[PDB]
């Protein structure tokens, strides 16, 4: 039963490590995606006049 319990103890180690730490991913996404449009919108806003 303790090796039942270890089971679960991955499950308790925390999959949701995936999901904890890509939140802090997703955050990153938002600055690179959002660098990304602005890396486009640099380059149009930057000029002509």
Same mark, same amino acid.
Not at 12 to 36: G, H, P, T, V, W
């Given at each position: 039963? /303790?090796?039942? $319990?270890?089971?679960?103890? +991955? &499950? $308790?180690?925390? /999959?949701?490590?995936? *999901? +904890? &730490?890509?939140? #802090?991913?997703?955050?990153? #996404? /938002? %600055?690179? /995606?959002? $660098? &990304?449009? *602005?890396d486009n919108k640099f380059i149009a806003s930057k000029? %002509?006049?």
């Amino acid at each position: 039963q /303790q090796m039942k $319990k270890l089971e679960e103890e +991955s &499950r $308790k180690a925390i /999959q949701i490590a995936e *999901n +904890s &730490r890509k939140a #802090d991913l997703d955050f990153i #996404d /938002q %600055e690179l /995606q959002k $660098k &990304r449009a *602005n890396d486009n919108k640099f380059i149009a806003s930057k000029m %002509e006049e």
